[PDB]
Write a protein that binds this ligand. Structure first.
Ligand SMILES: CC(C)=CCC[N@@H+](C)[C@@H]1CC=C(C)CC1
Ligand SMILES: CC(C)=CCC[N@@H+](C)[C@@H]1CC=C(C)CC1
Ligand SMILES: [Mg+2]
Ligand SMILES: [Mg+2]
Lengths: 354, 354
């Protein structure tokens, strides 16, 4: 603890950007801004509705902040899905993100989940009521198999949050707990399966590719975040339980051993990501290659992860990592750094109030 | 490999039985036969119903054989749940087992899964129709959290079977595939969460214990089966995709290296199983301790796994392992070896025909 392993999280970072073949960029600053606003505008209007405004107990500023964070992530990572697809996914991923804010015990609202579900009665928990109502707008872009994947992962995520409320990092010696919890709320199968709109792909035709992509992308996606993320949590305990911190508590190892473990899985998931899809269907490899780069581009740009600080304290160095850290860093900014004022407007609150 | 790793097998097996503290219990044969018949009787009557007889496309003999295999597993492992609970779980686990028999492509029957579900219209796929109809009888024995777990795992399992239809062992270099598939159809969270009936336990009170148990049991349960199963799935050219066989195809290692890998995870899951729950709530450790032993007892007794063959071949060897194994086996038999004629009757077909 204390004093960030500042270099390893640069080297590792470059190792990652190199492995994934951090080519240049996905869009052109204007294509991004174009999508950003399209997605944001549809979402903002959605969450601004009376019903949504009522059932979704969340602080306005938080909602605004979250919506904007999700839209960016989607628009920069699902680089090849229609504008509509970006938007709808953005609504769904905003719902999931906003659910992490609930402090309300699910228990009582989940006592009749299955009977209500099976009988088509509106769910008790208001979140389920909204998400299941909105789901068709997401699900329409996909085939039956990929849809099943989104449905499951979202269910898994609901359980994931329930567990998170107990702020439990696992019993010492419970090695299987950390990843069990990480998968539970990583939305991995939701992400990986949403990368294949039936309009651009055919599940039946690319079933083995898609299935393999879901399998592999799930871990790359969660671990790449856990890494980039380790910065805004190295100093924050208000987020006590985390894959790295749970490894420590569960596997009984040092924060460094834990952070080392993650770094090994991450670089490895990367190496294999490429080894498998490089020679596969071009369109497939392209969606994958783009999601990775976009995903990394987003982490480096969203103020959220405060990665700009790592920039500051590493702009004058002359290493073969401290430079490979900003050589890429900058690349991200030149195409992904965009002032919200250019796309995120008007504020959800304003639309809602109207 | 060419010949079975008998030596290696017998050892691993003992290390496993030792690690988990495999010892005789107070669950008497009379008690077993009593439960066996109770569960079987209720199930048989269930599957013998006209509707079940219609919608569940399965060969009678296979159904008979499966029902009997599932009842035994349940009754010998959920040693502390009510007779009714053993029965109901037996119906559910029989449904799941019988689904592996379908070659029918799920795709067309799953094109409207979510819309039908959300609207409360009977599912298109007949299996979902039956299982979701019968679900409340299982779910009544549990609290909301544990129920959510059963619901998810079962969904996961349905997808697991869909993937299995493609008889795909993973693309070479796709290390994440094997376990992805194994978890998908291991029903781990269904098993682990069904161990805590709300009549004997309180989710809210033992939440951390239960959650941890689900996380840990999932891997112990699937790997312990993959191991015991190894002897029968060795010379079965019919059995192509399996965790061990997929490790070979996916991780590009030898069948021995793969088998070796499994053996390490298995023994390890075991040690940690004990290290964690030994000092926890007595009732918890007891349900866990019993499930493991019962589960192992069942594998050694069910003719299915043809384990009696390794026994005979070794029963007259003055080896450290060999003899250590043979006694464990004998123990299992003396309490778990029971003639079907003592509990499984009349045959489902007969009841159905009536
Ligand atoms: C979008 C964020 C905050 C992080 C990326 C990591 N994923 C595992 C996310 C988990 C939570 C949601 C809502 C979506 C995907
Ligand atoms: C019960 C058999 C045949 C094998 C053990 C492997 N487990 C993963 C089972 C999968 C099928 C069910 C219903 C329960 C758990
Ligand atoms: Mg979060
Ligand atoms: Mg994180």
């Amino acid at each position: 603890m204390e004093n960030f392993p500042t270099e390893y999280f640069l080297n590792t970072t470059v190792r990652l950007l190199e492995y994934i073949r951090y080519r240049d960029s996905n869009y052109t600053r204007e294509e991004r801004i174009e999508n950003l606003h399209y997605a944001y505008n549809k979402a903002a209007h959605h969450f601004a509705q009376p019903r949504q405004q009522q059932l979704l107990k969340v602080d306005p500023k938080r909602l605004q902040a979250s919506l904007q964070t999700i839209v960016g992530m989607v628009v920069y990572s699902w680089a090849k899905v229609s504008k509509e697809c970006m938007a709808d996914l953005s609504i769904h991923y905003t719902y999931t993100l906003v659910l992490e804010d609930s402090k309300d015990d699910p228990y009582p609202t989940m006592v009749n989940y299955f009977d209500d579900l099976q009988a088509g009665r509106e769910q008790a928990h208001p979140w389920w009521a909204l998400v299941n109502e909105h789901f068709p707008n997401v699900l329409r872009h996909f085939g039956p198999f990929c849809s099943l994947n989104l449905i499951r992962s979202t269910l898994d995520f609901f359980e994931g949050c329930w567990i998170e409320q107990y702020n439990f990092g696992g019993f010492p010696g419970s090695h299987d707990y950390p990843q069990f919890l990480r998968r539970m709320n990583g939305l991995g199968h939701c992400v990986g399966a949403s990368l294949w709109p039936k309009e651009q792909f055919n599940e039946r035709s690319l079933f083995l590719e898609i299935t393999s992509a879901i399998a592999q992308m799930e871990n790359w996606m969660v671990w790449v975040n856990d890494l980039m993320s380790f910065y805004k949590e190295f100093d924050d305990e208000r987020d006590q339980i985390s894959l790295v911190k749970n490894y420590v508590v569960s596997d009984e190892i040092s924060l460094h051993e834990a952070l080392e473990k993650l770094t090994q899985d991450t670089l490895h998931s990367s190496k294999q990501m490429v080894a498998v899809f490089s020679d596969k269907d071009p369109q497939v490899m392209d969606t994958i290659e783009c999601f990775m780069h976009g995903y990394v581009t987003w982490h480096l740009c969203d103020r959220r992860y405060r990665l700009s600080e790592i920039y500051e304290k590493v702009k004058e160095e002359k290493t073969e990592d401290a430079q490979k850290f900003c050589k890429f860093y900058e690349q991200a900014a030149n195409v992904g750094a965009v002032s919200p004022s250019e796309w995120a407007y008007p504020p959800v609150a304003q639309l809602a109030n109207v």
